[PDB]
Design a binder for this molecule. Structure first.
Ligand SMILES: [Cl-]
Length: 284
């Protein structure tokens, strides 16, 4: 076998390649956005195109469609002759099938040390593109580290408490400091409310009375329905309910409608992290 030139650590077995991969299939959209930010978008040959966040739309034309965020088209993947497949938590059930086709990685973040683990994943992926990738990632990560510190410093000067909810077909689910939205709390140092929420990936259902009682100063909202292109009519009037409209968050202009597709479908990449930080400036 040819000698190893690049190595990629992840939650899976370390992948060792004899050259930079030029035919990549990815189900991880953050990884796609990292690859593009590093200057290697041409190397991505397959991505699911059923539900693509707007910020990534221009990659649709340069890839072949390999299915949906949860359901791969294995025939389409094999036909692309990939030299690397980037799986995702959502597609972990297909990792054995992916491995039959090509070396496969799957990046996982800690819910505790979200940013250190995410940076390690970004650096590992970037190294697949040699010194050029590694150098560019160092440069871009330095800017993100500085932006993160600036946000964290502002939050550390405040005592406001922030509640984070997912809105889905008129149902509200609250999420805690260690959750799919850890970046807000662990990394950016928004402060959670005193109410702890069953750490489920779908959150804990909350009523209008619950939100009133929590009494948040900032309310982050991720609208799942909009993120996936559903009928948003079921969410009409939810945030406008008097019990939410009378929170200090609402009255003070701190209901923050986070870009739905970015936050629900992506994250963990160089560009997605940058855009996420931009999105929360109005919450400071
Ligand atoms: Cl209620």
């Amino acid at each position: 076998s040819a000698p190893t030139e690049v190595t990629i650590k992840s939650s899976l077995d370390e992948v060792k390649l004899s050259k930079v991969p030029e035919k990549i299939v990815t189900f991880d959209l953050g990884a796609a956005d990292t690859i593009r930010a590093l200057g290697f978008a041409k190397n991505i040959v397959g991505m699911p195109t059923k539900t693509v966040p707007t910020y990534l739309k221009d990659l649709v034309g340069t890839v072949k469609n390999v299915g949906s965020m949860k359901e791969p088209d294995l025939e389409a993947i094999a036909a692309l002759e990939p030299d690397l497949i980037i799986a995702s938590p959502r597609t972990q059930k297909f990792v054995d099938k992916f491995k039959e086709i090509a070396p496969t990685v799957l990046f996982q973040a800690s819910k505790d040390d979200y940013w250190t683990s995410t940076k390690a994943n970004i650096e590992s992926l970037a190294s697949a593109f040699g010194e050029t990738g590694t150098q560019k990632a160092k440069e871009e990560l330095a800017k993100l580290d500085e932006s993160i510190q600036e946000v964290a410093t502002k939050n550390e000067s405040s005592d406001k408490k922030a509640l984070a909810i997912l809105l889905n077909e008129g149902k509200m689910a609250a999420f805690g400091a260690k959750s799919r939205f850890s970046f807000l709390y662990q990394t950016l140092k928004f402060k959670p409310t005193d109410t702890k929420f069953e750490d489920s990936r779908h959150g804990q259902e909350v009523s209008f009375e619950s939100v009133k009682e929590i009494n948040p100063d900032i309310l982050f909202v991720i609208n799942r329905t909009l993120a996936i292109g559903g009928d948003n009519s079921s969410n009409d009037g939810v945030l406008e309910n008097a019990l939410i409209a009378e929170t200090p968050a609402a009255k003070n202009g701190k209901i923050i409608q986070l870009t739905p597709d970015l936050w629900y479908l992506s994250g963990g990449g160089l560009e997605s992290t940058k855009l996420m930080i931009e999105d929360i400036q109005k919450a400071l």
